[PDB]
Amino acid sequence: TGRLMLAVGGAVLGSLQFGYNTGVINAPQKVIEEFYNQTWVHRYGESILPTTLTTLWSLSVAIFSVGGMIGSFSVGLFVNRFGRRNSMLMMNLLAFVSAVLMGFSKLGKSFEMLILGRFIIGVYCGLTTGFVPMYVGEVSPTALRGALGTLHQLGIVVGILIAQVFGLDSIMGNKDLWPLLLSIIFIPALLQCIVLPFCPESPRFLLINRNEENRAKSVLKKLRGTADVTHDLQEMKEESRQMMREKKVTILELFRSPAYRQPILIAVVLQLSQQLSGINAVFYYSTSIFEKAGVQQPVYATIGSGIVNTAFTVVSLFVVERAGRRTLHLIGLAGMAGCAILMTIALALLEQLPWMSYLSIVAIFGFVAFFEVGPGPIPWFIVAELFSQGPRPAAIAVAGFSNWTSNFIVGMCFQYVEQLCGPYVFIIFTVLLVLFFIFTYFKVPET
């Protein structure tokens, strides 16, 4: 387990970029929007309409989710045809193409380039969320398979934190360096191009997908570190048998069989309960929300939510195992509804009380803290536990489509719903946070 580190460290670089790309468009919203109006001026001798400047910037962040959907749809296409390692390596192309489009979008005076780059890197991120968990699982010793699989979540949450830090006026969240803020992703990509070619190919890919029974020996000994691996090798040949038993059902057969229509409904909802709860309302627009409240140094409060998120993710790991799943998803769904209530108060009494902007900070700090123990991980700890090795694939793909879709709904509609509800937006999240509470209380079984 010495070369094992390099193989994992090179893989998590994708999940770091996943988090970084999820939250670079938070702090620098004001500056890029100014570039949008300045570009609109140069083109049509006209100041941009505030409603278009809204739907346009919303499209700039939301189109990323569209890409993630297509990406998550294409995981299996590349992963079995080209292997796990080689897929992660070649798909660094999208990151490099993306970084150029976004980094040079200012010099090119084109919000299209920024939008188009945002879309592509989204595709990379939708593919990455399927490469990294699969590769780290098809490489780790069975014992460490649980722990090492954690790093995907950590990379995502840490990646968000780094993007929020770099989004300060001091570093790159300003008028001169926001193109470098979106482009810096090329450094992670370059680091993954240097590393990966030295990393091993998935033994399972060599063994099953490629029939390289003895070439798979070579990886396991250098990788697992030990001398021989007749324990590990046979373990893979037991899963391959168990997995090839029941015919893999397709997405189509999943909808049509009334045997699956109840658990699939539970899955899709648990996914909707993650995105429509409204965390990406903060992780996309935190800096904007805090400002509307009346917070000095709002970006720092966004860095705050990022730090809280990382802390409560390290915590969630020690809790999910030592407690039940049905309880945690309700504990989180409730604490979020409460914080969403806390928010609304601090957002109404602020016009009168100039200090509730401190309560709004606590509101979101706890709003994300409760998400990271409930609606965050559990939706995945249930889908895999609701299905066997036959329908679990098609279930994951559907649940993934549900996640990206509801993610696209918040990212694209939150600002449109904000210009109507005033300080009552989080009521909508509090409404849903209740409906989801009701649903999981009666219709979700414990596992």
| Positions that interact with ligand 5RE (CB under 6 A) | 68, 72, 129-130, 133, 152, 156, 279, 376, 380, 396, 400, 403-404
As measured in angstroms, the least distance from the Cβ of 399 to ligand 5RE is 6
58 CB neighbour count, 10 Å cutoff: 18
CB closer to ligand 5RE, 21 vs 440: 21
CB closer to ligand 5RE, 130 vs 366: 130
CB closer to ligand 5RE, 233 vs 320: 320
In terms of C-beta distances under 8 Å and separation of at least 24 residues, what long-range contacts does 362-367 make, across chains too? 363/339, 364/282, 364/286, 364/289, 364/290, 364/301, 364/305, 364/339, 365/304, 365/305, 365/308, 366/335, 366/338, 366/339, 366/342, 367/279, 367/282, 367/335, 367/336, 367/339, 367/340, 367/342, 367/343
CB closer to ligand 5RE, 118 vs 224: 118
Q: Is 57 annotated as a binding residue?
A: no
C-alpha 168/C-alpha 176 separation (Å) is 12
Residues across the chain: 447
As measured in angstroms, the least distance from the Cβ of 286 to ligand 5RE is 12
The residues, any chain, with a CB within 8 Å of residue 353's CB and separated by 6 or more, are: none
Ranked by CB distance to ligand 5RE, the top (closest) residue is 400
The CA distances from residue 61 to 64, 86, 110, 367, 409, in Å, are: 6, 29, 15, 22, 11
Q: Is 403 annotated as a binding residue?
A: yes
As measured in angstroms, the least distance from the Cβ of 392 to ligand 5RE is 10
As measured in angstroms, the least distance from the Cβ of 132 to ligand 5RE is 9
User: Which one, of 366, 392, 228, lies nearest residue 304 by Cα?
Assistant: 366
CB closer to ligand 5RE, 357 vs 402: 402
CB closer to ligand 5RE, 68 vs 200: 68
Q: Is 178 annotated as a binding residue?
A: no
R_g (Cα) of the chain, nearest Å: 22
As measured in angstroms, the least distance from the Cβ of 112 to ligand 5RE is 25
Tokens of 318: 């020690």
Q: Is 209 annotated as a binding residue?
A: no
Q: Is 274 annotated as a binding residue?
A: yes
Phi, psi of 138, rounded to the nearest 5 degrees: -90, 25
Q: Is 80 annotated as a binding residue?
A: no
As measured in angstroms, the least distance from the Cβ of 383 to ligand 5RE is 8
Tokens of 407: 């993610």
Q: Which positions make up the binding site for D-glucose?
A: 274-275, 280, 309, 372
Q: Which positions make up the binding site?
A: 129, 274-275, 280, 309, 372, 380, 403
